[PDB]
Ligand binder design. Structure first.
Ligand SMILES: [Cl-]
Length: 424
């Protein structure tokens, strides 16, 4: 089988067209309207204008020799109120995107939920409400019904840890809640929606179904604080998915999780793959409160995000997961933000991104050459885009995007990756 060399994006981060063609607003449209939620005061509009420029963007993928494209479908384009009414212009756009990928030799790799919950559902309680899980499954169904003839890979959710905890506890992500019980309700309904979606997907013909999780491996001098960090970030969604139930709580005095009877059996549905998102480890020490850990400074070289560059961390992570996960792994995101500047040249010099990607590729391939069933590697991202709370200030792309003209300019890392893929 062909190992999948890919690149990854998400709908709200690149599309624009936020109020075109019947698109309903999402929780990110509203969150971005709040003063100080986005550091540069920016919004999803108009991201990279990908909704009009997707031909051009696929041609960029072709010119790197990439063989797979990981993207998300915007739920609010498909069902503008989240449930019930279906907007055919929505499915028409993704239908045409899929045809073009196939005509260009590219394997579609589809994410159903990448954070853009329809605002209509959030105003009925969003992921805190059990009904949102059933709305998710109905959405998943309508997508596979239209797309599964040509899209081999569907992932239900992208990083539900961010959606639960950054979305409902630290309030850093949309909606923007700060309540641990709202977060645990959200974690449980994201998982319940995952399981219900799996059944809808298969019933509608999806061939490979999985999920994409974020791993931030924890290191430090005290094993106990390491284990608390690992339970909170690395096992809280994986263990349920694996059918081991939730891990022992990392929280002091947690509130109840609205686990209903049979929910855990629904959540632990057989999958065809696990998507691994990795960027950095975290160094921890013993800390005090609700979550009794303290997060320490990066040891040595760090990206613009202040995230430690530690390629060995990906290798170790893949070995550990290789023993524990009974499905093949895909690294569905890996990449780095550095402050790229462009002043007219035909290429944007990003030697730190080149260094970052080369070392991480060598790590992942090493895990595979030691017998991890690793079947693909995707760079976040194809191009510079809207980076959530960071707006346009953190550039992660293989292509530089000059946002005023939408011109795409290749960086050194694009040329590095093209040659990388070729040397297969
Ligand atoms: Cl996650």
């Amino acid at each position: 089988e062909k190992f999948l060399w890919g690149v990854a994006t998400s709908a709200y981060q690149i599309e624009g067209a936020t109020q075109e063609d019947g698109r309903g607003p999402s929780i990110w449209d509203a969150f971005a309207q709040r003063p100080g939620a986005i550091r540069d005061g920016s919004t999803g509009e108009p991201a990279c204008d990908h909704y009009r420029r997707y031909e051009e963007d696929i041609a960029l993928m072709q010119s790197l020799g990439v063989r797979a494209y990981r993207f998300s479908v915007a739920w609010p384009r498909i069902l503008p109120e989240g449930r019930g009414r279906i907007n055919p212009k929505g499915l028409a756009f993704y239908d045409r995107l899929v045809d073009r990928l196939l005509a260009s030799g590219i394997t579609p790799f589809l994410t159903l939920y990448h954070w853009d919950l329809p605002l209509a559902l959030e105003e009925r309680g969003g992921w805190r409400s059990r009904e949102t899980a059933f709305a998710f499954a109905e959405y998943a169904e309508a997508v596979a019904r239209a797309l599964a003839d040509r899209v081999p890979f569907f992932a239900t959710l992208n990083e539900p840890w961010c959606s639960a905890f950054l979305g409902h506890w630290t309030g850093e992500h949309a909606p923007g809640l700060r309540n641990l019980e709202a977060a645990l309700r959200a974690a449980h309904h994201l998982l319940l929606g995952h399981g219900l979606a799996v059944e809808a997907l298969r019933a509608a013909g999806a061939r490979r179904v999985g999920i994409v999780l974020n791993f931030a491996p924890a290191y430090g001098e005290d094993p106990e604080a390491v284990d608390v960090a690992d339970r909170y970030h690395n096992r809280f969604f994986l263990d349920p998915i694996l059918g081991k139930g939730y891990p022992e709580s990392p929280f002091r005095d947690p509130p109840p999780v609205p686990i209903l009877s049979r929910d855990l059996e629904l959540v632990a549905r057989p999958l065809d793959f696990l998507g691994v998102n990795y960027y950095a480890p975290v160094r921890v020490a013993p800390g005090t409160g609700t979550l009794p850990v303290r997060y320490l400074p990066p040891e040595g070289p760090a990206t613009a995000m202040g995230w430690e560059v530690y390629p060995e961390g990906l290798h170790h992570l893949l070995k550990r997961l290789g023993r524990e996960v009974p499905w093949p792994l895909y690294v569905t995101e890996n990449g780095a933000a550095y402050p790229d500047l462009w002043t007219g040249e035909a290429v944007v010099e990003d030697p730190e991104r080149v260094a970052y990607l080369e070392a991480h590729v060598e790590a992942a391939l090493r895990a595979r050459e030691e017998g991890v069933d690793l079947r693909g590697y995707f760079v976040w991202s194809l191009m510079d885009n809207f980076e959530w709370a960071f707006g346009y200030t953190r550039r992660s792309g293989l292509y530089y995007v000059d946002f005023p003209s939408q011109r795409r300019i290749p960086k050194r890392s694009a040329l590095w990756y093209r040659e990388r893929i070729a040397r297969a």
